[PDB]
Amino acid sequence: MMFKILRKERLAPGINLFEIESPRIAKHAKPGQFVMIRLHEKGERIPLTIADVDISKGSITIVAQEVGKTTRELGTYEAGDYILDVLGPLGKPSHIDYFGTVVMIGGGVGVAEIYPVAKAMKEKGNYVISILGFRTKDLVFWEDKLRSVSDEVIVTTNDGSYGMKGFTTHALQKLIEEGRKIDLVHAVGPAIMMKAVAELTKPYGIKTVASLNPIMVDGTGMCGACRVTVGGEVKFACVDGPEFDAHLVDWDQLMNRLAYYRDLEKISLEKWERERRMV
Amino acid sequence: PRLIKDRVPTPERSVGERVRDFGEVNLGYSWELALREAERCLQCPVEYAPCIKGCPVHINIPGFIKALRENRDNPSKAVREALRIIWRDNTLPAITGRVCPQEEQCEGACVVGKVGDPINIGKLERFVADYAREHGIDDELLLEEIKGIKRNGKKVAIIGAGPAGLTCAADLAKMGYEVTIYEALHQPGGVLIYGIPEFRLPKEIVKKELENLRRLGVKIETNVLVGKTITFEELREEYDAIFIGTGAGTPRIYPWPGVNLNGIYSANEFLTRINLMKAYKFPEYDTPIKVGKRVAVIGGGNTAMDAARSALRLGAEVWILYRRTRKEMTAREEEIKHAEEEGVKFMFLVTPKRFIGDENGNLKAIELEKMKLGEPDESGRRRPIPTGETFIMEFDTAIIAIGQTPNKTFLETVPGLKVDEWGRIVVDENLMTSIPGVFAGGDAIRGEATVILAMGDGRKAAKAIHQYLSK
Ligand SMILES: Cc1cc2nc3c(=O)[nH]c(=O)nc-3n(C[C@H](O)[C@H](O)[C@H](O)COP(=O)(O)OP(=O)(O)OC[C@H]3O[C@@H](n4cnc5c(N)ncnc54)[C@H](O)[C@@H]3O)c2cc1C
Numbered sequence: 001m002m003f004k005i006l007r008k009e010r011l012a013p014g015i016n017l018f019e020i021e022s023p024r025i026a027k028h029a030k031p032g033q034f035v036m037i038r039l040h041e042k043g044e045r046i047p048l049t050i051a052d053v054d055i056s057k058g059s060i061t062i063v064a065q066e067v068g069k070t071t072r073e074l075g076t077y078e079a080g081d082y083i084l085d086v087l088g089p090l091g092k093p094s095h096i097d098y099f100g101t102v103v104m105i106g107g108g109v110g111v112a113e114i115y116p117v118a119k120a121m122k123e124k125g126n127y128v129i130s131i132l133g134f135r136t137k138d139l140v141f142w143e144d145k146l147r148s149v150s151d152e153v154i155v156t157t158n159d160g161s162y163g164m165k166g167f168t169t170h171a172l173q174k175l176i177e178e179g180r181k182i183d184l185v186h187a188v189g190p191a192i193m194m195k196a197v198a199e200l201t202k203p204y205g206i207k208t209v210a211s212l213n214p215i216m217v218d219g220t221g222m223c224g225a226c227r228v229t230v231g232g233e234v235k236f237a238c239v240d241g242p243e244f245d246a247h248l249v250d251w252d253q254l255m256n257r258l259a260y261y262r263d264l265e266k267i268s269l270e271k272w273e274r275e276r277r278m279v
Numbered sequence: 280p281r282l283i284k285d286r287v288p289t290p291e292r293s294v295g296e297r298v299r300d301f302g303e304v305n306l307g308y309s310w311e312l313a314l315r316e317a318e319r320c321l322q323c324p325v326e327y328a329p330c331i332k333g334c335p336v337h338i339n340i341p342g343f344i345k346a347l348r349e350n351r352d353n354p355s356k357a358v359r360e361a362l363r364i365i366w367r368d369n370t371l372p373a374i375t376g377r378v379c380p381q382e383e384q385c386e387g388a389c390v391v392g393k394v395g396d397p398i399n400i401g402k403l404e405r406f407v408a409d410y411a412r413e414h415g416i417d418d419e420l421l422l423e424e425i426k427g428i429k430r431n432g433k434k435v436a437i438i439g440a441g442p443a444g445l446t447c448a449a450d451l452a453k454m455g456y457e458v459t460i461y462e463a464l465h466q467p468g469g470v471l472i473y474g475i476p477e478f479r480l481p482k483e484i485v486k487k488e489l490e491n492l493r494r495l496g497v498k499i500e501t502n503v504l505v506g507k508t509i510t511f512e513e514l515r516e517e518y519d520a521i522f523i524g525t526g527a528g529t530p531r532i533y534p535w536p537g538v539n540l541n542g543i544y545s546a547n548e549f550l551t552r553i554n555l556m557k558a559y560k561f562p563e564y565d566t567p568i569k570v571g572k573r574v575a576v577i578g579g580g581n582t583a584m585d586a587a588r589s590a591l592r593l594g595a596e597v598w599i600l601y602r603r604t605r606k607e608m609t610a611r612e613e614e615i616k617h618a619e620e621e622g623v624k625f626m627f628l629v630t631p632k633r634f635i636g637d638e639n640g641n642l643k644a645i646e647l648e649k650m651k652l653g654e655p656d657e658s659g660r661r662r663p664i665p666t667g668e669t670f671i672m673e674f675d676t677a678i679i680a681i682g683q684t685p686n687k688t689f690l691e692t693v694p695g696l697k698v699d700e701w702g703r704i705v706v707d708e709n710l711m712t713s714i715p716g717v718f719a720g721g722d723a724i725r726g727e728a729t730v731i732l733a734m735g736d737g738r739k740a741a742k743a744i745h746q747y748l749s750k
Pocket residue numbers: 034045046047048049050062063064065066067068069070071072109113212213214215216217242258259265266
């Protein structure tokens with residue numbers, strides 16, 4: 001069959017939460033894993049992280065930021081609509097060890113993505129500091145939810161409209177310069193943010209893991225669309241990750257590859273917008 | 280006997296029309312042409328006929344041909360009797376007649392091909408299946424099979440919905456089992472749906488088999504990656520037996536410098552985007568695909584030919600870059616010829632050394648090493664030997680088609696399953712794996728092979744499952 005939307009919540013402008021009926025995925029999903037979805041028969045497959053699960057309801061939760069045609073179209077869906085295809089849980093679960101103090105860094109929709117990982121880290125006994133990065137105050141979401149699974153939360157806005165002014169990396173650099181004990185940094189967000197976090201921590205030798213976000217098609221290892229270079233070796237993020245040692249990732253290659261379809265992505269979005277103008 | 284040495288030709292669409300779309304190139308026989316071709320067959324005795332020995336499942340080729348000739352005046356009866364004969368050994372004749380490498384199989388063995396053109400067995404088999412489908416004759420025979428089903432109460436799971444799994448499922452259903460197929464992608468068909476393009480395997484032919492499975496009472500669950508969505512142990516608890524038909528779906532990638540430059544695709548990615556996601560219809564369909572003005576396709580098999588001919592249909596100038604010569608290529612001869620006709624350019628005795636990019640990370644050129652032929656290797660073909668001479672050729676896009684291999688990620692998670700060093704599941708003479716009650720077939724046990732072998736293994740495994748569960 002298809003996959004019923006049980007609930008939709010607008011968390012912030014352009015940030016839409018969907019609770020989806022999928023008892024198989026709910027039963028098996030672990031923090032860090034993702035799904036591929038396809039909305040309808042003409043659609044493309046896109047990856048989205050499993051931000052929460054509810055085994056008692058047989059549901060999973062995904063949070064999709066509006067960035068282009070597929071996520072804008074998804075943003076119009078309501079409870080009782082259906083997602084045609086949902087494949088999961090995909091990827092390797094995040095590795096949850098007692099590390100000591102873990103700094104969890106979520107940028108934008110990455111704040112939803114880090115929630116299950118932060119929760120698992122906390123349940124394993126780690127001291128958890130969550131740095132949340134947003135562009136501006138109206139995009140802030142899930143502060144209380146992250147606080148519920150963290151020992152400390154630092155909210156940043158680029159423009160200083162709420163919390164600490166600056167980037168995620170400004171908050172992290174402040175912790176380092178204060179001499180705070182940090183045993184692991186986990187980063188999830190835009191590739192430019194994950195690269196910046198990795199470059200900040202590398203001179204300090206702080207173990208840093210990033211959840212990579214390359215282009216995906218099947219999501220099961222068949223094709224290499226999602227390939228990355230890690231420690232000089234080709235890996236397929238959907239099956240070998242998507243989490244890797246951030247200090248071994250070829251960030252410039254990843255960002256180059258993510259830009260390949262920009263012109264076609266614009267054409268597709270423009271067509272969808274043009275064909276919805278009359279009302 | 281006297282021999283009519285020239286084949287009756289099948290009509291094909293013109294190159295100029297067909298390079299503008301993904302529609303089927305070869306239009307197949309009409310009844311009148313098929314009957315004329317059938318008349319060329321010498322009707323060698325079944326207990327000798329070399330075409331039968333060359334068919335991997337030993338279809339009674341002279342018998343089905345005879346059924347056409349003996350019913351010259353009643354095409355529906357002719358086709359019904361011919362299809363009945365074929366279906367004794369082959370579930371997928373509309374597919375295999377189109378895609379078998381017959382020059383290495385039935386037709387390569389046909390006696391008429393020693394002095395002229397072999398009997399066009401594949402096109403006759405295709406004709407029987409296609410005519411039957413167009414006239415509901417296959418449905419008639421299928422309903423006849425369905426009447427004979429006696430449900431036995433036992434449940435079997437199939438992992439993978441390619442030709443092996445689809446075939447195994449149908450045979451088990453006919454034996455009375457309650458069958459569920461689990462498929463990771465959003466549509467079933469395996470390579471038949473995502474790999475081989477519509478210009479030689481129309482999706483209608485695969486969809487017909489899915490309709491047949493619906494009528495047989497088989498359940499198909501898509502979006503199930505076994506090992507993740509459902510565990511293998513969960514299947515063992517719920518099912519009386521399992522058949523693993525997971526193919527060889529991971530790309531082989533050689534560590535060429537520059538292979539991650541933009542514009543370089545595996546053939547699996549390129550073909551999946553084109554065939555499964557209909558990217559050639561972008562932006563009507565949402566999945567994009569990008570080819571530059573000049574495309575290189577690395578390899579010489581069917582995958583390479585399919586990628587090259589697909590890229591040509593997107594408007595590019597396309598080169599096959601192959602490390603041996605024409606004689607050694609492994610693609611179907613008919614499709615090499617179609618590629619030549621359509622304007623694919625061929626460069627032989629070359630292999631990539633590295634891919635060269637521009638400033639923005641986009642492919643700009645390929646440095647190629649020249650090769651020379653040496654002694655025959657294990658396959659009996661002269662091996663390629665590098666000469667040390669290299670040169671640089673400009674390209675905007677490259678498609679890597681150097682083979683596929685099984686997914687070790689899935690395989691390692693299957694508790695207790697023995698797999699060889701090439702990723703092939705080890706099976707006994709009954710296609711049973713190291714886990715009792717778990718069987719395997721197709722590319723999962725052979726590495727990349729053929730549709731007909733996957734079909735044959737699915738039927739053999741169904742019989743073995745029945746024996747195992749009946750004892
Ligand atoms: C493992 C993984 C988990 C992810 N989890 C989330 C999540 O929880 N929430 C969320 O909002 N986003 C997530 N993403 C990113 C999401 O996949 C893309 O934003 C989405 O595909 C954009 O598609 P679009 O058509 O809406 O916009 P498009 O115009 O198609 O793309 C816009 C941007 O998204 C990227 N992108 C395009 N196509 C793909 C593709 N097929 N796969 C991945 N990225 C692509 C491009 O770099 C581009 O800059 C995840 C990506 C990956 C790889």
